[PDB]
Protein backbone atom coordinates (compact mmCIF):
# COMPACT_ATOMS: atom_id res chain seq x y z
CA UNK A 1 0.00 0.00 0.00
CA UNK A 2 1.17 3.48 -0.88
CA UNK A 3 -0.55 6.64 0.21
CA UNK A 4 0.51 10.26 -0.03
CA UNK A 5 -1.56 13.28 0.95
CA UNK A 6 -0.66 16.64 -0.56
CA UNK A 7 -2.55 19.64 0.84
CA UNK A 8 -1.21 21.91 -1.93
CA UNK A 9 -2.74 19.67 -4.59
CA UNK A 10 -2.13 22.31 -7.28
CA UNK A 11 1.52 21.16 -7.28
CA UNK A 12 0.40 17.84 -8.79
CA UNK A 13 -1.89 19.57 -11.31
CA UNK A 14 1.04 21.73 -12.49
CA UNK A 15 3.47 18.78 -12.57
CA UNK A 16 1.20 16.80 -14.89
CA UNK A 17 0.61 19.85 -17.11
CA UNK A 18 4.42 20.24 -17.31
CA UNK A 19 4.86 16.56 -18.30
CA UNK A 20 2.01 15.45 -20.54
CA UNK A 21 3.09 17.40 -23.61
CA UNK A 22 6.67 16.08 -23.54
CA UNK A 23 5.96 12.41 -22.66
CA UNK A 24 2.97 10.06 -22.99
CA UNK A 25 3.85 7.33 -20.49
CA UNK A 26 6.18 7.22 -17.54
CA UNK A 27 7.03 5.12 -14.53
CA UNK A 28 6.50 6.65 -11.10
CA UNK A 29 9.13 5.13 -8.80
CA UNK A 30 7.81 5.29 -5.29
CA UNK A 31 9.91 4.51 -2.30
CA UNK A 32 10.02 5.66 1.28
CA UNK A 33 12.24 8.58 0.22
CA UNK A 34 9.61 10.08 -2.08
CA UNK A 35 8.36 9.96 -5.66
CA UNK A 36 10.77 9.89 -8.57
CA UNK A 37 9.99 9.95 -12.27
CA UNK A 38 12.52 9.75 -15.08
CA UNK A 39 11.66 9.51 -18.75
CA UNK A 40 13.14 10.29 -22.16
CA UNK A 41 10.86 11.69 -24.79
CA UNK A 42 10.22 9.39 -27.76
CA UNK A 43 12.88 11.08 -29.93
CA UNK A 44 15.51 10.61 -27.22
CA UNK A 45 16.37 14.29 -27.54
CA UNK A 46 15.21 15.29 -24.02
CA UNK A 47 14.72 13.72 -20.62
CA UNK A 48 12.66 14.92 -17.67
CA UNK A 49 13.37 14.06 -14.04
CA UNK A 50 10.85 14.70 -11.27
CA UNK A 51 11.64 14.53 -7.55
CA UNK A 52 8.96 14.85 -4.85
CA UNK A 53 10.46 14.12 -1.43
CA UNK A 54 8.58 12.14 1.25
CA UNK A 55 8.94 15.08 3.64
CA UNK A 56 7.21 17.45 1.18
CA UNK A 57 3.92 15.59 1.60
CA UNK A 58 1.56 16.12 4.52
CA UNK A 59 1.28 12.37 5.00
CA UNK A 60 3.41 9.89 3.13
CA UNK A 61 3.56 6.13 3.38
CA UNK A 62 5.36 3.43 1.27
CA UNK A 63 4.97 -0.06 2.73
CA UNK A 64 7.04 -1.28 -0.16
CA UNK A 65 8.78 0.12 -3.21
CA UNK A 66 6.57 0.45 -6.32
CA UNK A 67 7.04 1.29 -9.99
CA UNK A 68 3.65 2.41 -11.35
CA UNK A 69 3.28 2.66 -15.12
CA UNK A 70 1.05 5.63 -15.93
CA UNK A 71 -0.44 7.09 -19.07
CA UNK A 72 0.32 10.77 -18.38
CA UNK A 73 -2.42 12.01 -20.70
CA UNK A 74 -4.97 10.02 -18.70
CA UNK A 75 -3.58 11.18 -15.36
CA UNK A 76 -3.55 14.75 -16.72
CA UNK A 77 -7.25 14.44 -17.60
CA UNK A 78 -8.12 13.19 -14.13
CA UNK A 79 -6.15 15.95 -12.40
CA UNK A 80 -8.08 18.59 -14.39
CA UNK A 81 -11.05 17.34 -12.32
CA UNK A 82 -9.35 18.68 -9.16
CA UNK A 83 -9.84 22.28 -8.10
CA UNK A 84 -6.75 24.43 -7.59
CA UNK A 85 -7.19 24.52 -3.80
CA UNK A 86 -8.07 20.83 -3.43
CA UNK A 87 -6.26 18.47 -1.12
CA UNK A 88 -5.05 15.56 -3.26
CA UNK A 89 -4.32 12.08 -1.95
CA UNK A 90 -2.66 9.38 -4.07
CA UNK A 91 -3.18 5.63 -3.25
CA UNK A 92 -2.13 2.34 -4.61
CA UNK A 93 -2.78 -1.18 -3.29
CA UNK A 94 -0.42 -4.16 -3.12
CA UNK A 95 -1.25 -5.40 -6.60
CA UNK A 96 -0.91 -1.94 -8.01
CA UNK A 97 -3.35 -2.45 -10.77
CA UNK A 98 -4.89 1.01 -10.37
CA UNK A 99 -3.94 4.37 -8.92
CA UNK A 100 -6.61 5.97 -6.76
CA UNK A 101 -6.81 9.77 -6.61
CA UNK A 102 -8.92 11.59 -4.01
CA UNK A 103 -9.77 15.30 -4.35
CA UNK A 104 -11.02 17.18 -1.26
CA UNK A 105 -11.47 20.78 -0.07
CA UNK A 106 -11.11 21.74 3.62
CA UNK A 107 -14.89 22.20 3.81
CA UNK A 108 -15.37 18.70 2.63
CA UNK A 109 -18.57 19.19 0.74
CA UNK A 110 -17.35 17.79 -2.59
CA UNK A 111 -15.17 14.69 -2.34
CA UNK A 112 -14.05 13.19 -5.63
CA UNK A 113 -12.63 9.70 -6.04
CA UNK A 114 -10.97 8.59 -9.28
CA UNK A 115 -9.51 5.18 -10.18
CA UNK A 116 -7.21 5.04 -13.20
CA UNK A 117 -5.73 1.92 -14.73
CA UNK A 118 -1.98 1.53 -14.67
CA UNK A 119 -0.02 -0.14 -17.47
CA UNK A 120 3.10 -2.30 -17.96
CA UNK A 121 6.18 -0.31 -19.04
CA UNK A 122 9.80 -1.37 -19.55
CA UNK A 123 11.02 0.50 -16.59
CA UNK A 124 14.41 1.21 -17.94
CA UNK A 125 16.06 3.40 -15.31
CA UNK A 126 19.02 5.65 -15.88
CA UNK A 127 21.29 7.94 -13.88
CA UNK A 128 22.74 11.44 -14.00
CA UNK A 129 26.24 12.08 -12.63
CA UNK A 130 26.09 15.14 -10.35
CA UNK A 131 28.52 17.56 -11.99
CA UNK A 132 29.29 21.23 -11.82
CA UNK A 133 28.78 23.22 -14.99
CA UNK A 134 30.85 25.93 -16.63
CA UNK A 135 27.87 28.32 -16.42
CA UNK A 136 24.78 28.38 -14.20
CA UNK A 137 22.15 31.05 -14.94
CA UNK A 138 19.37 31.78 -12.45
CA UNK A 139 16.64 33.99 -13.87
CA UNK A 140 12.87 34.60 -13.65
CA UNK A 141 10.97 31.72 -15.18
CA UNK A 142 8.48 33.98 -16.97
CA UNK A 143 11.33 35.85 -18.68
CA UNK A 144 12.94 32.65 -19.96
CA UNK A 145 9.57 31.42 -21.27
CA UNK A 146 9.00 34.69 -23.13
CA UNK A 147 12.51 34.57 -24.69
CA UNK A 148 11.99 30.97 -25.91
CA UNK A 149 8.54 31.82 -27.28
CA UNK A 150 9.68 34.98 -29.09
CA UNK A 151 12.85 33.46 -30.59
CA UNK A 152 10.86 30.45 -31.86
CA UNK A 153 9.14 32.87 -34.25
CA UNK A 154 12.57 33.79 -35.66
CA UNK A 155 14.16 30.34 -36.04
CA UNK A 156 13.97 26.85 -34.62
CA UNK A 157 17.36 26.82 -32.83
CA UNK A 158 18.72 29.15 -30.14
CA UNK A 159 22.40 29.84 -29.46
CA UNK A 160 22.98 30.44 -25.74
CA UNK A 161 26.23 32.31 -25.07
CA UNK A 162 27.02 32.72 -21.40
CA UNK A 163 29.71 35.05 -20.04
CA UNK A 164 30.64 36.39 -16.60
CA UNK A 165 28.58 39.57 -16.95
CA UNK A 166 25.58 38.41 -18.99
CA UNK A 167 23.84 35.81 -21.10
CA UNK A 168 22.77 36.20 -24.73
CA UNK A 169 20.14 34.21 -26.70
CA UNK A 170 20.31 34.28 -30.52
CA UNK A 171 18.30 32.78 -33.37
CA UNK A 172 18.04 33.22 -37.14
CA UNK A 173 15.77 32.13 -39.95
CA UNK A 174 14.01 33.38 -43.04
CA UNK A 175 12.61 36.54 -41.39
CA UNK A 176 16.07 37.63 -40.29
CA UNK A 177 17.75 37.22 -36.94
CA UNK A 178 17.53 38.34 -33.35
CA UNK A 179 19.58 38.51 -30.18
CA UNK A 180 18.40 38.99 -26.61
CA UNK A 181 20.93 40.19 -24.02
CA UNK A 182 20.32 39.74 -20.28
CA UNK A 183 22.53 41.51 -17.77
CA UNK A 184 23.29 40.29 -14.28
CA UNK A 185 21.22 42.41 -11.88
CA UNK A 186 13.53 39.36 -10.69
CA UNK A 187 17.23 38.81 -10.31
CA UNK A 188 19.46 37.46 -13.04
CA UNK A 189 22.62 35.96 -11.55
CA UNK A 190 25.42 34.06 -13.27
CA UNK A 191 27.92 31.68 -11.63
CA UNK A 192 30.54 31.14 -14.34
CA UNK A 193 33.81 29.18 -14.23
CA UNK A 194 34.23 29.54 -17.96
CA UNK A 195 32.31 30.88 -20.95
CA UNK A 196 30.03 28.60 -22.98
CA UNK A 197 28.34 28.79 -26.38
CA UNK A 198 25.73 26.09 -27.15
CA UNK A 199 22.88 25.59 -29.64
CA UNK A 200 19.53 24.04 -28.67
CA UNK A 201 16.27 23.14 -30.38
CA UNK A 202 13.67 25.75 -29.41
CA UNK A 203 10.75 23.34 -29.85
CA UNK A 204 11.90 21.36 -26.78
CA UNK A 205 12.62 24.43 -24.65
CA UNK A 206 9.03 25.49 -25.29
CA UNK A 207 7.89 22.15 -23.87
CA UNK A 208 10.04 22.70 -20.79
CA UNK A 209 8.51 26.10 -20.03
CA UNK A 210 5.12 24.48 -19.42
CA UNK A 211 6.66 24.03 -15.93
CA UNK A 212 6.80 27.82 -15.45
CA UNK A 213 3.80 27.91 -12.99
CA UNK A 214 5.77 25.73 -10.54
CA UNK A 215 8.38 28.36 -9.73
CA UNK A 216 9.06 32.04 -10.20
CA UNK A 217 12.69 31.15 -10.92
CA UNK A 218 14.44 28.82 -13.36
CA UNK A 219 18.08 27.70 -13.49
CA UNK A 220 20.00 26.86 -16.65
CA UNK A 221 23.19 24.78 -16.27
CA UNK A 222 25.58 24.44 -19.21
CA UNK A 223 28.98 23.02 -20.13
CA UNK A 224 30.56 22.27 -23.48
CA UNK A 225 29.34 19.17 -25.20
CA UNK A 226 26.92 18.08 -22.47
CA UNK A 227 23.14 18.38 -22.16
CA UNK A 228 21.65 21.62 -20.90
CA UNK A 229 19.83 21.31 -17.56
CA UNK A 230 16.67 23.42 -17.13
CA UNK A 231 15.50 23.12 -13.52
CA UNK A 232 12.34 24.34 -11.75
CA UNK A 233 12.26 24.06 -7.97
CA UNK A 234 9.06 22.73 -6.41
CA UNK A 235 9.20 24.62 -3.15
CA UNK A 236 9.65 22.56 0.03
CA UNK A 237 9.44 19.36 -1.94
CA UNK A 238 11.82 18.76 -4.84
CA UNK A 239 12.24 19.78 -8.46
CA UNK A 240 11.48 19.24 -12.12
CA UNK A 241 14.64 19.04 -14.27
CA UNK A 242 14.76 18.90 -18.06
CA UNK A 243 17.82 17.75 -20.03
CA UNK A 244 18.37 18.81 -23.64
CA UNK A 245 21.13 17.49 -25.85
CA UNK A 246 22.95 20.26 -27.77
CA UNK A 247 23.11 20.49 -31.55
CA UNK A 248 26.26 19.36 -33.40
Amino acid sequence: MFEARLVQGSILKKVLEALKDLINEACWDISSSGVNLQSMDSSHVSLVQLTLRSEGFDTYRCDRNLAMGVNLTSMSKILKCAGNEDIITLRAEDNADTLALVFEAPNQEKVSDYEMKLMDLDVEQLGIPEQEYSCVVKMPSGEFARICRDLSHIGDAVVISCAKDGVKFSASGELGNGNIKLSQTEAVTIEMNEPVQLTFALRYLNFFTKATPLSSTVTLSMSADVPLVVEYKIADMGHLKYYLAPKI
Binding site: M40, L47, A201, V226, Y243, A245
Partner: peptide, 8 residues
Protein backbone atom coordinates in the same frame (compact mmCIF):
# COMPACT_ATOMS: atom_id res chain seq x y z
CA UNK B 1 20.91 17.18 -33.39
CA UNK B 2 22.43 14.71 -30.87
CA UNK B 3 20.54 12.25 -28.60
CA UNK B 4 20.64 11.51 -24.88
CA UNK B 5 21.64 7.98 -23.69
CA UNK B 6 24.59 8.87 -25.88
CA UNK B 7 25.21 11.21 -22.93
CA UNK B 8 24.01 8.96 -20.15
Amino acid sequence: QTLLDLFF
